DNA sequence: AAACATTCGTTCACGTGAGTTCCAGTACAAGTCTGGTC
């Protein structure tokens, strides 16, 4: 997703911008899902934008 | 004088380069489905 933005249609209080599926993980169990704490940490890490680090070459 | 070896023009098979047709991979563009909010 491009970023995480506030919303009122979802329980987490936030929704993704431009979401798309990259892979249906057949190796991850259901209990390995993200947690609200991790989502809050990711949201606060870079002001909601999911692109933080710098391209290198 | 008679027998054997060599040479020559011919013949066949097999291999390699250039032309033509057909199909797969690639590129791009448009269509279709979806997401989010105000």
């Amino acid at each position: 997703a491009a970023e995480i933005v506030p919303s009122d249609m979802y329980k987490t209080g936030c929704t993704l911008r431009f979401p798309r599926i990259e892979k249906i993980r057949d190796d991850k169990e259901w209990h390995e899902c993200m947690t609200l704490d991790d989502l809050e940490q990711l949201r606060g890490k870079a002001s909601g934008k999911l692109a933080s680090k710098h391209l290198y070459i």
Side-chain angles (χ1 to χ4, degrees):
Chain A
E3 48 178 288
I4 297 156
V5 289
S7 155
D8 48 29
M9 306 258 285
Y10 304 94
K11 191 72 169 170
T12 53
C14 63
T15 181
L16 311 178
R17 205 181 151 218
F18 302 153
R20 49 232 183 234
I21 295 173
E22 288 325 347
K23 74 192 311 313
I24 288 142
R25 314 213 64 195
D26 45 43
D27 56 9
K28 285 293 212 117
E29 301 256 349
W30 63 278
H31 58 270
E32 324 213 331
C33 189
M34 259 188 63
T35 311
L36 276 146
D37 318 335
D38 302 5
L39 189 99
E40 290 292 341
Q41 172 175 329
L42 195 71
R43 188 178 182 198
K45 131 175 176 193
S47 94
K49 299 282 282 138
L50 290 169
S52 307
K53 39 154 152 143
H54 304 178
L55 191 43
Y56 288 103
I57 192 157

Short mmCIF file of all heavy atoms in Angstrom, two decimals, chain A residues 2-53:
data_model
loop_
_atom_site.label_atom_id
_atom_site.label_comp_id
_atom_site.label_asym_id
_atom_site.label_seq_id
_atom_site.Cartn_x
_atom_site.Cartn_y
_atom_site.Cartn_z
N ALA A 2 0.34 2.32 -0.59
CA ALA A 2 1.05 3.59 -0.60
C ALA A 2 1.25 4.12 0.82
O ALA A 2 2.36 4.51 1.19
CB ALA A 2 0.28 4.60 -1.44
N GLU A 3 0.20 4.13 1.63
CA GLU A 3 0.29 4.68 2.98
C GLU A 3 -0.93 4.24 3.78
O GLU A 3 -1.83 3.56 3.27
CB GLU A 3 0.41 6.20 2.95
CG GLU A 3 -0.59 6.90 2.06
CD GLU A 3 -0.46 8.40 2.11
OE1 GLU A 3 -0.81 9.00 3.14
OE2 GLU A 3 0.02 8.99 1.11
N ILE A 4 -0.96 4.65 5.05
CA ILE A 4 -2.05 4.37 5.97
C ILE A 4 -2.70 5.69 6.34
O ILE A 4 -2.01 6.63 6.76
CB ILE A 4 -1.54 3.64 7.23
CG1 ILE A 4 -0.96 2.28 6.87
CG2 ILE A 4 -2.66 3.48 8.23
CD1 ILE A 4 0.03 1.77 7.88
N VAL A 5 -4.02 5.77 6.19
CA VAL A 5 -4.74 7.03 6.37
C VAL A 5 -5.88 6.82 7.36
O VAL A 5 -6.45 5.72 7.42
CB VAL A 5 -5.26 7.56 5.04
CG1 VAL A 5 -4.11 8.07 4.19
CG2 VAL A 5 -6.03 6.49 4.30
N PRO A 6 -6.27 7.83 8.13
CA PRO A 6 -7.38 7.65 9.07
C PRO A 6 -8.68 7.39 8.33
O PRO A 6 -8.89 7.84 7.20
CB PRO A 6 -7.42 8.98 9.83
CG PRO A 6 -6.76 9.95 8.94
CD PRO A 6 -5.71 9.19 8.19
N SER A 7 -9.57 6.64 8.98
CA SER A 7 -10.86 6.31 8.40
C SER A 7 -11.83 5.97 9.53
O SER A 7 -11.42 5.66 10.65
CB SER A 7 -10.75 5.14 7.43
OG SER A 7 -11.98 4.46 7.30
N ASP A 8 -13.12 6.04 9.21
CA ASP A 8 -14.17 5.74 10.16
C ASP A 8 -15.02 4.54 9.76
O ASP A 8 -15.99 4.23 10.45
CB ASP A 8 -15.09 6.96 10.34
CG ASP A 8 -15.51 7.57 9.03
OD1 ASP A 8 -15.60 6.83 8.03
OD2 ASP A 8 -15.75 8.79 8.99
N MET A 9 -14.67 3.86 8.67
CA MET A 9 -15.40 2.69 8.21
C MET A 9 -14.80 1.38 8.70
O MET A 9 -15.32 0.32 8.35
CB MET A 9 -15.45 2.68 6.68
CG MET A 9 -15.99 3.95 6.05
SD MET A 9 -17.70 3.79 5.51
CE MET A 9 -17.49 2.81 4.03
N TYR A 10 -13.73 1.43 9.49
CA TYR A 10 -13.03 0.23 9.91
C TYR A 10 -12.70 0.32 11.40
O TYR A 10 -12.58 1.42 11.95
CB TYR A 10 -11.76 0.02 9.09
CG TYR A 10 -12.03 -0.04 7.61
CD1 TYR A 10 -11.93 1.09 6.82
CD2 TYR A 10 -12.38 -1.23 7.01
CE1 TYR A 10 -12.18 1.03 5.47
CE2 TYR A 10 -12.63 -1.30 5.66
CZ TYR A 10 -12.53 -0.16 4.89
OH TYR A 10 -12.78 -0.22 3.55
N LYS A 11 -12.55 -0.84 12.02
CA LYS A 11 -12.37 -0.89 13.47
C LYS A 11 -11.01 -0.34 13.88
O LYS A 11 -10.89 0.31 14.93
CB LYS A 11 -12.54 -2.32 13.97
CG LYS A 11 -12.64 -2.43 15.48
CD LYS A 11 -13.96 -1.92 16.00
CE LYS A 11 -14.17 -2.27 17.46
NZ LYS A 11 -15.35 -1.57 18.04
N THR A 12 -9.98 -0.59 13.09
CA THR A 12 -8.65 -0.10 13.43
C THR A 12 -8.56 1.41 13.41
O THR A 12 -7.58 1.96 13.91
CB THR A 12 -7.61 -0.68 12.47
OG1 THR A 12 -8.01 -0.43 11.12
CG2 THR A 12 -7.46 -2.17 12.69
N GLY A 13 -9.55 2.09 12.84
CA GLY A 13 -9.48 3.53 12.70
C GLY A 13 -8.59 4.00 11.57
O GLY A 13 -8.40 5.21 11.42
N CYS A 14 -8.05 3.08 10.77
CA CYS A 14 -7.19 3.44 9.66
C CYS A 14 -7.41 2.45 8.52
O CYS A 14 -7.84 1.32 8.73
CB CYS A 14 -5.72 3.44 10.08
SG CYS A 14 -5.10 1.84 10.61
N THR A 15 -7.12 2.92 7.31
CA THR A 15 -7.27 2.12 6.11
C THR A 15 -6.11 2.41 5.17
O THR A 15 -5.50 3.48 5.22
CB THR A 15 -8.60 2.41 5.40
OG1 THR A 15 -8.71 1.59 4.23
CG2 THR A 15 -8.69 3.87 5.00
N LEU A 16 -5.81 1.45 4.31
CA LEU A 16 -4.70 1.59 3.39
C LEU A 16 -5.10 2.43 2.18
O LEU A 16 -6.27 2.55 1.84
CB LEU A 16 -4.20 0.22 2.94
CG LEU A 16 -3.95 -0.79 4.05
CD1 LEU A 16 -3.50 -2.11 3.47
CD2 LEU A 16 -2.92 -0.25 5.03
N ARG A 17 -4.09 3.01 1.54
CA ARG A 17 -4.27 3.76 0.30
C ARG A 17 -3.64 2.97 -0.84
O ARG A 17 -2.48 2.56 -0.75
CB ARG A 17 -3.63 5.14 0.40
CG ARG A 17 -4.23 6.17 -0.53
CD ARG A 17 -3.54 7.51 -0.39
NE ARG A 17 -3.58 8.27 -1.63
CZ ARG A 17 -2.58 9.02 -2.09
NH1 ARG A 17 -1.44 9.14 -1.44
NH2 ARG A 17 -2.74 9.67 -3.24
N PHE A 18 -4.40 2.76 -1.90
CA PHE A 18 -3.97 1.96 -3.04
C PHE A 18 -3.48 0.58 -2.59
O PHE A 18 -2.29 0.26 -2.73
CB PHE A 18 -2.88 2.68 -3.83
CG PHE A 18 -3.30 4.03 -4.34
CD1 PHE A 18 -2.35 5.01 -4.57
CD2 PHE A 18 -4.62 4.31 -4.61
CE1 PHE A 18 -2.72 6.24 -5.05
CE2 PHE A 18 -4.99 5.54 -5.08
CZ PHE A 18 -4.04 6.51 -5.30
N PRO A 19 -4.35 -0.25 -2.03
CA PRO A 19 -3.93 -1.58 -1.60
C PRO A 19 -4.01 -2.59 -2.74
O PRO A 19 -4.91 -2.54 -3.59
CB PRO A 19 -4.93 -1.92 -0.49
CG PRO A 19 -6.16 -1.21 -0.89
CD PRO A 19 -5.74 0.04 -1.61
N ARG A 20 -3.07 -3.53 -2.74
CA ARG A 20 -3.05 -4.61 -3.71
C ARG A 20 -2.38 -5.82 -3.09
O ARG A 20 -1.60 -5.71 -2.15
CB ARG A 20 -2.34 -4.20 -5.00
CG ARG A 20 -0.98 -3.56 -4.80
CD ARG A 20 -0.89 -2.24 -5.53
NE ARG A 20 0.43 -1.63 -5.40
CZ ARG A 20 0.66 -0.40 -4.98
NH1 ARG A 20 -0.32 0.42 -4.65
NH2 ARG A 20 1.92 0.03 -4.88
N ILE A 21 -2.69 -6.99 -3.64
CA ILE A 21 -2.17 -8.26 -3.13
C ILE A 21 -0.87 -8.58 -3.85
O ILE A 21 -0.83 -8.61 -5.09
CB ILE A 21 -3.19 -9.39 -3.31
CG1 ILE A 21 -4.43 -9.13 -2.45
CG2 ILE A 21 -2.57 -10.73 -2.94
CD1 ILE A 21 -5.56 -10.09 -2.69
N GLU A 22 0.19 -8.83 -3.08
CA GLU A 22 1.47 -9.24 -3.64
C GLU A 22 1.67 -10.75 -3.61
O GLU A 22 2.32 -11.29 -4.51
CB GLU A 22 2.62 -8.56 -2.90
CG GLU A 22 2.82 -7.04 -3.14
CD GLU A 22 2.51 -6.53 -4.54
OE1 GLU A 22 2.34 -7.33 -5.49
OE2 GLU A 22 2.41 -5.30 -4.70
N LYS A 23 1.15 -11.44 -2.60
CA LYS A 23 1.23 -12.89 -2.57
C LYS A 23 0.33 -13.44 -1.48
O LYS A 23 0.26 -12.88 -0.38
CB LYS A 23 2.68 -13.37 -2.37
CG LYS A 23 3.21 -13.20 -0.96
CD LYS A 23 4.72 -13.40 -0.89
CE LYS A 23 5.18 -14.68 -1.58
NZ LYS A 23 4.36 -15.87 -1.21
N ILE A 24 -0.34 -14.55 -1.79
CA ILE A 24 -1.13 -15.30 -0.81
C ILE A 24 -0.17 -16.28 -0.15
O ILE A 24 0.17 -17.31 -0.73
CB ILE A 24 -2.31 -16.01 -1.46
CG1 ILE A 24 -3.39 -15.01 -1.87
CG2 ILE A 24 -2.90 -17.05 -0.52
CD1 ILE A 24 -4.06 -15.35 -3.18
N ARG A 25 0.25 -15.97 1.08
CA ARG A 25 1.31 -16.74 1.71
C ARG A 25 0.79 -18.09 2.17
O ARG A 25 -0.07 -18.16 3.05
CB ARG A 25 1.89 -15.96 2.89
CG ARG A 25 2.16 -14.50 2.58
CD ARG A 25 3.36 -13.99 3.34
NE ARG A 25 4.59 -14.66 2.96
CZ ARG A 25 5.72 -14.61 3.65
NH1 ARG A 25 5.82 -13.92 4.77
NH2 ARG A 25 6.78 -15.28 3.21
N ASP A 26 1.31 -19.16 1.57
CA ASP A 26 0.97 -20.51 1.98
C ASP A 26 1.87 -21.04 3.09
O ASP A 26 1.63 -22.14 3.59
CB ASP A 26 1.04 -21.47 0.78
CG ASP A 26 2.27 -21.26 -0.07
OD1 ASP A 26 3.37 -21.10 0.51
OD2 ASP A 26 2.15 -21.26 -1.31
N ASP A 27 2.90 -20.29 3.47
CA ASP A 27 3.82 -20.70 4.52
C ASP A 27 3.52 -20.07 5.87
O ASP A 27 4.05 -20.54 6.89
CB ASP A 27 5.26 -20.37 4.13
CG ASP A 27 5.46 -18.89 3.81
OD1 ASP A 27 4.53 -18.10 4.06
OD2 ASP A 27 6.54 -18.53 3.31
N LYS A 28 2.69 -19.04 5.92
CA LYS A 28 2.37 -18.35 7.16
C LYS A 28 1.07 -18.88 7.73
O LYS A 28 0.07 -19.00 7.01
CB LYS A 28 2.27 -16.84 6.92
CG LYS A 28 3.61 -16.14 6.73
CD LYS A 28 4.44 -16.16 8.01
CE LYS A 28 5.32 -14.92 8.13
NZ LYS A 28 4.95 -14.09 9.31
N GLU A 29 1.07 -19.19 9.02
CA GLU A 29 -0.14 -19.63 9.69
C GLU A 29 -1.03 -18.43 10.02
O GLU A 29 -0.62 -17.27 9.93
CB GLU A 29 0.20 -20.40 10.96
CG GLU A 29 1.05 -21.64 10.73
CD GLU A 29 0.26 -22.94 10.81
OE1 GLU A 29 -0.91 -22.91 11.25
OE2 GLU A 29 0.82 -23.99 10.44
N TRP A 30 -2.27 -18.73 10.41
CA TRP A 30 -3.22 -17.66 10.71
C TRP A 30 -2.84 -16.90 11.97
O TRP A 30 -3.17 -15.71 12.09
CB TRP A 30 -4.62 -18.24 10.86
CG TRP A 30 -4.76 -19.21 11.98
CD1 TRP A 30 -4.42 -20.53 11.98
CD2 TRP A 30 -5.27 -18.94 13.29
NE1 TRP A 30 -4.69 -21.09 13.19
CE2 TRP A 30 -5.21 -20.14 14.02
CE3 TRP A 30 -5.78 -17.79 13.91
CZ2 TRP A 30 -5.64 -20.22 15.34
CZ3 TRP A 30 -6.20 -17.88 15.22
CH2 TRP A 30 -6.13 -19.09 15.92
N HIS A 31 -2.15 -17.54 12.91
CA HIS A 31 -1.78 -16.91 14.17
C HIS A 31 -0.48 -16.12 14.07
O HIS A 31 -0.03 -15.57 15.08
CB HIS A 31 -1.66 -17.95 15.28
CG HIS A 31 -0.67 -19.04 14.98
ND1 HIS A 31 -1.02 -20.20 14.34
CD2 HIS A 31 0.65 -19.14 15.27
CE1 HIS A 31 0.05 -20.98 14.22
NE2 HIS A 31 1.07 -20.36 14.78
N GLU A 32 0.12 -16.04 12.88
CA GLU A 32 1.28 -15.19 12.64
C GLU A 32 0.89 -13.85 12.04
O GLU A 32 1.75 -13.14 11.50
CB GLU A 32 2.27 -15.91 11.72
CG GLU A 32 2.36 -17.41 11.95
CD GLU A 32 3.75 -17.95 11.71
OE1 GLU A 32 4.48 -17.38 10.87
OE2 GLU A 32 4.12 -18.96 12.35
N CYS A 33 -0.39 -13.49 12.12
CA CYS A 33 -0.87 -12.25 11.53
C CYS A 33 -0.27 -11.05 12.25
O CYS A 33 0.23 -11.15 13.37
CB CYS A 33 -2.39 -12.20 11.59
SG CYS A 33 -3.15 -10.84 10.67
N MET A 34 -0.34 -9.90 11.58
CA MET A 34 0.05 -8.66 12.23
C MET A 34 -0.82 -8.44 13.47
O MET A 34 -1.83 -9.11 13.69
CB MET A 34 -0.11 -7.48 11.27
CG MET A 34 1.19 -7.01 10.65
SD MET A 34 1.00 -5.49 9.70
CE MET A 34 0.50 -4.35 10.99
N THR A 35 -0.39 -7.48 14.29
CA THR A 35 -1.11 -7.12 15.50
C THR A 35 -1.30 -5.61 15.52
O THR A 35 -0.54 -4.87 14.89
CB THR A 35 -0.36 -7.58 16.76
OG1 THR A 35 0.02 -8.95 16.61
CG2 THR A 35 -1.23 -7.44 17.99
N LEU A 36 -2.32 -5.16 16.24
CA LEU A 36 -2.61 -3.74 16.31
C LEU A 36 -1.38 -2.95 16.74
O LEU A 36 -1.16 -1.83 16.27
CB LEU A 36 -3.76 -3.48 17.28
CG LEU A 36 -5.17 -3.63 16.73
CD1 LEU A 36 -6.10 -4.16 17.80
CD2 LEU A 36 -5.67 -2.31 16.19
N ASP A 37 -0.57 -3.52 17.63
CA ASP A 37 0.63 -2.83 18.08
C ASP A 37 1.60 -2.60 16.93
O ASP A 37 2.15 -1.50 16.76
CB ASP A 37 1.31 -3.62 19.20
CG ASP A 37 0.31 -4.19 20.19
OD1 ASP A 37 -0.80 -3.63 20.32
OD2 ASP A 37 0.64 -5.20 20.85
N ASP A 38 1.82 -3.63 16.11
CA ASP A 38 2.72 -3.49 14.98
C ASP A 38 2.17 -2.48 13.97
O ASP A 38 2.93 -1.70 13.40
CB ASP A 38 2.94 -4.85 14.31
CG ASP A 38 3.50 -5.88 15.26
OD1 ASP A 38 3.65 -5.57 16.46
OD2 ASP A 38 3.81 -7.00 14.81
N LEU A 39 0.86 -2.50 13.75
CA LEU A 39 0.26 -1.54 12.83
C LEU A 39 0.44 -0.11 13.34
O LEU A 39 0.75 0.79 12.56
CB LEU A 39 -1.21 -1.85 12.63
CG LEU A 39 -1.91 -1.05 11.53
CD1 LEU A 39 -2.00 -1.87 10.25
CD2 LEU A 39 -3.29 -0.63 11.98
N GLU A 40 0.24 0.11 14.64
CA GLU A 40 0.44 1.44 15.19
C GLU A 40 1.89 1.87 15.07
O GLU A 40 2.18 3.03 14.74
CB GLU A 40 0.00 1.46 16.66
CG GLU A 40 -1.50 1.35 16.85
CD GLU A 40 -2.26 2.56 16.35
OE1 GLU A 40 -1.63 3.63 16.18
OE2 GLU A 40 -3.48 2.45 16.12
N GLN A 41 2.82 0.95 15.32
CA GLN A 41 4.24 1.27 15.18
C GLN A 41 4.57 1.66 13.75
O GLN A 41 5.27 2.65 13.50
CB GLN A 41 5.08 0.08 15.64
CG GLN A 41 6.56 0.22 15.36
CD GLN A 41 7.36 -0.92 15.94
OE1 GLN A 41 7.00 -1.49 16.96
NE2 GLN A 41 8.46 -1.27 15.28
N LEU A 42 4.07 0.89 12.78
CA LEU A 42 4.32 1.21 11.38
C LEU A 42 3.69 2.54 10.99
O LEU A 42 4.28 3.32 10.24
CB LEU A 42 3.79 0.08 10.49
CG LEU A 42 4.27 0.07 9.05
CD1 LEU A 42 5.73 -0.33 8.97
CD2 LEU A 42 3.41 -0.88 8.23
N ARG A 43 2.48 2.81 11.50
CA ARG A 43 1.81 4.06 11.18
C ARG A 43 2.58 5.25 11.72
O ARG A 43 2.70 6.28 11.04
CB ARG A 43 0.39 4.03 11.75
CG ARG A 43 -0.49 5.18 11.34
CD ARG A 43 -1.88 5.02 11.92
NE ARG A 43 -2.78 6.10 11.51
CZ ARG A 43 -3.92 6.39 12.12
NH1 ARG A 43 -4.34 5.71 13.17
NH2 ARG A 43 -4.66 7.39 11.66
N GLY A 44 3.10 5.14 12.94
CA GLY A 44 3.83 6.24 13.54
C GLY A 44 5.28 6.35 13.13
O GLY A 44 5.91 7.38 13.40
N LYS A 45 5.83 5.32 12.49
CA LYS A 45 7.25 5.33 12.16
C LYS A 45 7.59 6.43 11.16
O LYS A 45 8.60 7.12 11.32
CB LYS A 45 7.67 3.96 11.63
CG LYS A 45 8.47 3.98 10.34
CD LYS A 45 8.92 2.58 9.98
CE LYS A 45 9.63 2.54 8.64
NZ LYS A 45 9.80 1.15 8.14
N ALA A 46 6.77 6.61 10.13
CA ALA A 46 7.09 7.54 9.05
C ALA A 46 5.87 8.36 8.65
O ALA A 46 5.62 8.60 7.47
CB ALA A 46 7.65 6.79 7.84
N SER A 47 5.10 8.81 9.64
CA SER A 47 3.96 9.69 9.41
C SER A 47 2.88 9.05 8.54
O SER A 47 2.10 9.75 7.90
CB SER A 47 4.41 11.02 8.79
OG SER A 47 4.32 10.98 7.37
N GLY A 48 2.83 7.72 8.51
CA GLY A 48 1.84 6.99 7.75
C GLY A 48 2.32 6.52 6.39
O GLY A 48 1.79 5.53 5.87
N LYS A 49 3.31 7.19 5.80
CA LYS A 49 3.83 6.76 4.51
C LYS A 49 4.61 5.47 4.68
O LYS A 49 5.44 5.35 5.59
CB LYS A 49 4.71 7.85 3.91
CG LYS A 49 3.99 9.16 3.64
CD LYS A 49 3.15 9.09 2.38
CE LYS A 49 4.01 9.24 1.13
NZ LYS A 49 3.62 8.28 0.06
N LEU A 50 4.35 4.50 3.81
CA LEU A 50 4.99 3.20 3.88
C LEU A 50 6.33 3.15 3.16
O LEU A 50 7.00 2.12 3.19
CB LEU A 50 4.05 2.13 3.31
CG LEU A 50 2.82 1.82 4.17
CD1 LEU A 50 1.83 0.98 3.40
CD2 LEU A 50 3.22 1.13 5.45
N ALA A 51 6.73 4.24 2.50
CA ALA A 51 8.03 4.35 1.87
C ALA A 51 8.90 5.25 2.74
O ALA A 51 8.68 6.47 2.78
CB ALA A 51 7.91 4.92 0.45
N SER A 52 9.87 4.66 3.43
CA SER A 52 10.71 5.41 4.36
C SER A 52 12.18 5.39 3.98
O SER A 52 12.81 6.45 3.96
CB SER A 52 10.53 4.84 5.78
OG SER A 52 9.16 4.80 6.14
N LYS A 53 12.74 4.22 3.68
CA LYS A 53 14.18 4.15 3.46
C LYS A 53 14.53 4.68 2.07
O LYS A 53 13.66 4.94 1.23
CB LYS A 53 14.69 2.73 3.64
CG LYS A 53 13.80 1.62 3.12
CD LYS A 53 14.65 0.41 2.77
CE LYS A 53 13.87 -0.89 2.90
NZ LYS A 53 14.25 -1.85 1.84
#
